[PDB]
Design a protein around this motif. Structure first.
Motif, PDB file in Angstrom:
ATOM      1  N   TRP A  45       0.861  -1.190   0.000  1.00 22.36           N
ATOM      2  CA  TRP A  45       0.000   0.000   0.000  1.00 22.36           C
ATOM      3  C   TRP A  45       0.898   1.241   0.000  1.00 22.36           C
ATOM      4  O   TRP A  45       2.070   1.201   0.382  1.00 22.36           O
ATOM      5  N   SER A  52      -4.908   5.923   2.383  1.00 19.04           N
ATOM      6  CA  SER A  52      -4.194   4.677   2.253  1.00 19.04           C
ATOM      7  C   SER A  52      -4.741   4.031   1.011  1.00 19.04           C
ATOM      8  O   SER A  52      -5.959   4.028   0.813  1.00 19.04           O
ATOM      9  N   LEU A  53      -3.836   3.621   0.127  1.00 19.12           N
ATOM     10  CA  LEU A  53      -4.243   3.058  -1.155  1.00 19.12           C
ATOM     11  C   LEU A  53      -3.477   1.782  -1.409  1.00 19.12           C
ATOM     12  O   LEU A  53      -2.233   1.756  -1.273  1.00 19.12           O
ATOM     13  N   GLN A  54      -4.250   0.740  -1.737  1.00 18.26           N
ATOM     14  CA  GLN A  54      -3.710  -0.567  -2.051  1.00 18.26           C
ATOM     15  C   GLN A  54      -3.236  -0.498  -3.490  1.00 18.26           C
ATOM     16  O   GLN A  54      -3.971  -0.046  -4.369  1.00 18.26           O
ATOM     17  N   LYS A  56      -1.734  -2.136  -7.121  1.00 19.70           N
ATOM     18  CA  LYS A  56      -1.797  -3.285  -8.007  1.00 19.70           C
ATOM     19  C   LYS A  56      -0.421  -3.899  -8.131  1.00 19.70           C
ATOM     20  O   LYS A  56       0.578  -3.249  -7.803  1.00 19.70           O
ATOM     21  N   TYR A  58       1.274  -4.490 -10.694  1.00 18.58           N
ATOM     22  CA  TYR A  58       1.993  -3.817 -11.772  1.00 18.58           C
ATOM     23  C   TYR A  58       2.086  -2.324 -11.620  1.00 18.58           C
ATOM     24  O   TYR A  58       2.311  -1.639 -12.614  1.00 18.58           O
ATOM     25  N   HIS A  59       1.871  -1.789 -10.424  1.00 19.49           N
ATOM     26  CA  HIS A  59       2.116  -0.352 -10.221  1.00 19.49           C
ATOM     27  C   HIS A  59       3.546  -0.152  -9.783  1.00 19.49           C
ATOM     28  O   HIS A  59       4.238  -1.116  -9.402  1.00 19.49           O
ATOM     29  N   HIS A  64       4.173   6.779  -7.669  1.00 18.06           N
ATOM     30  CA  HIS A  64       3.028   7.168  -6.853  1.00 18.06           C
ATOM     31  C   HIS A  64       3.523   8.045  -5.732  1.00 18.06           C
ATOM     32  O   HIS A  64       2.881   9.051  -5.414  1.00 18.06           O
ATOM     33  N   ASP A  67       4.126  11.137  -7.451  1.00 12.76           N
ATOM     34  CA  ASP A  67       2.880  11.761  -7.904  1.00 12.76           C
ATOM     35  C   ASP A  67       1.802  12.017  -6.845  1.00 12.76           C
ATOM     36  O   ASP A  67       0.659  12.299  -7.188  1.00 12.76           O
ATOM     37  N   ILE A  71      -2.339  12.972  -6.776  1.00 12.80           N
ATOM     38  CA  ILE A  71      -3.169  11.870  -6.257  1.00 12.80           C
ATOM     39  C   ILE A  71      -4.013  12.393  -5.122  1.00 12.80           C
ATOM     40  O   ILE A  71      -5.241  12.239  -5.142  1.00 12.80           O
ATOM     41  N   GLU A  74      -6.607  14.712  -6.631  1.00 11.15           N
ATOM     42  CA  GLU A  74      -7.639  13.862  -7.268  1.00 11.15           C
ATOM     43  C   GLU A  74      -8.611  13.256  -6.259  1.00 11.15           C
ATOM     44  O   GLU A  74      -9.804  13.214  -6.513  1.00 11.15           O
ATOM     45  N   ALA A 219     -10.883  -1.468   4.243  1.00 10.65           N
ATOM     46  CA  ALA A 219     -10.029  -0.330   3.885  1.00 10.65           C
ATOM     47  C   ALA A 219     -10.828   0.925   4.178  1.00 10.65           C
ATOM     48  O   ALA A 219     -12.028   1.003   3.850  1.00 10.65           O
ATOM     49  N   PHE A 221     -11.850   4.961   4.040  1.00 12.70           N
ATOM     50  CA  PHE A 221     -11.917   6.170   3.255  1.00 12.70           C
ATOM     51  C   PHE A 221     -12.557   7.279   4.085  1.00 12.70           C
ATOM     52  O   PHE A 221     -13.426   6.993   4.950  1.00 12.70           O
ATOM     53  N   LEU A 296     -14.698  -0.723  -5.015  1.00  8.45           N
ATOM     54  CA  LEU A 296     -14.407  -1.754  -4.060  1.00  8.45           C
ATOM     55  C   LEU A 296     -15.691  -2.482  -3.601  1.00  8.45           C
ATOM     56  O   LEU A 296     -15.661  -3.683  -3.396  1.00  8.45           O
TER      57      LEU A 296
END
Lengths: 305, 7
Positions: A45, A52-54, A56, A58-59, A64, A67, A71, A74, A219, A221, A296
């Motif tokens: 994460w 808090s962001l899980q 992928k 392939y990230h 991140h 960025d 983020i 956004e 998770a 938010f 989610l």
């Protein structure tokens, strides 16, 4: 060349980036010393204090990290300059309870526990006193070893031991009254020549007691509801459904199982609506994480039947 | 598309 990966107890391990700031999450997993059984329970994460962001598989974590302000821009209404992101080892939010329920891997138990403990202690678990008293007693054995009467028998249960075995949200008013039952049960773990001594059996017993908490594995938010009257909320989303906490107190406002509620996208991407199946009432949650929450919810509900 | 889909 290298990057810190934290656990939820705050400790961290140093890792080597095979492709520099281009290194993926999947690579990093393999980058550490871990099998695809072990990697079944957690992934990377990226979290700052308020998001808090899980990731992928392939990230590219570091980008991140690079960025983050946009983020943040956004996804939240925070000031970008006041958040620093870090990489974390944490539970996969897709991890079905049933699969977790078979966990035997010492390492995974530990990552998962450190996370459960953090959640317990910060107040994200609502559970009855009995449950909370049980977990506290497990924390005592884990952190201080066998009960020994010379030191304890009450007088060594000072608000500062306590601070580390009960949720911060119960610690000033509720938990001072639980101190006897907490020691009693603590005495029984140490006194139990049937219940196992070992560090991973205790941790696992700990997770066992958490598995039924409604918000377990969620998770979180952040968001807001307009009852001029604005209630700041954590939206919890887990393998069991949708949960709203008060951001100030952590009081559970509502808990809804998949099937007993439906959700609709807001008119804009910055809110969503929840319609109660039984209560026959509606509410809207505002948060720029709307798209996240809603995906989610689709994904986790679909993991059923 | 890819870099912004979490979870």
């Amino acid at each position: 060349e290298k990057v810190r990966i934290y656990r939820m107890d705050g400790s961290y391990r140093s890792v080597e980036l095979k492709h520099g700031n281009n290194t993926t999450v999947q690579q990093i997993m393999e980058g550490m010393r871990l099998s695809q059984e072990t990697q079944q329970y957690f992934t990377i994460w990226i979290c700052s204090e308020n998001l808090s962001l899980q990731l992928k598989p392939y990230h590219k974590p570091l980008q991140h990290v690079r960025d983050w302000p946009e983020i943040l821009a956004e996804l939240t209404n925070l000031d970008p300059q006041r958040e620093t992101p870090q990489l974390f080892l944490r539970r996969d939010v897709r991890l079905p309870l049933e699969v977790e329920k078979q966990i035997e891997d010492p390492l995974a138990i530990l990552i998962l526990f450190d996370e459960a403990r953090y959640n317990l202690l910060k107040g994200f678990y609502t559970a009855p006193d009995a449950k909370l008293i049980t977990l506290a007693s497990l924390l005592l054995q884990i952190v201080y070893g066998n009960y020994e009467s010379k030191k304890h028998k009450q007088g060594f249960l000072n608000e500062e031991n306590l601070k580390s075995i009960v949720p911060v949200t119960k610690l000033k008013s509720k938990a001072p009254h639980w101190t006897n039952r907490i020691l009693h049960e603590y005495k029984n773990l140490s006194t139990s020549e049937g219940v196992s001594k070992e560090m991973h059996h205790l941790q696992r017993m700990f997770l066992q007691n958490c598995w039924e908490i409604p918000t377990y594995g969620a998770a979180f938010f952040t968001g807001q509801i307009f009852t001029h009257k604005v209630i700041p909320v954590y939206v919890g989303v887990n393998i069991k459904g949708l949960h709203l906490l008060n951001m100030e107190t952590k009081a559970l406002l509502i808990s809804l199982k998949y099937g007993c509620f439906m959700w609709q996208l807001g008119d804009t991407d910055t809110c969503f609506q929840i319609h109660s199946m039984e209560n026959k009432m509606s509410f809207i949650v505002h948060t720029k994480q709307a798209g996240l929450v809603v995906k989610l919810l689709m994904k986790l509900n679909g993991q059923l039947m | 598309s890819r870099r912004r889909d979490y979870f």
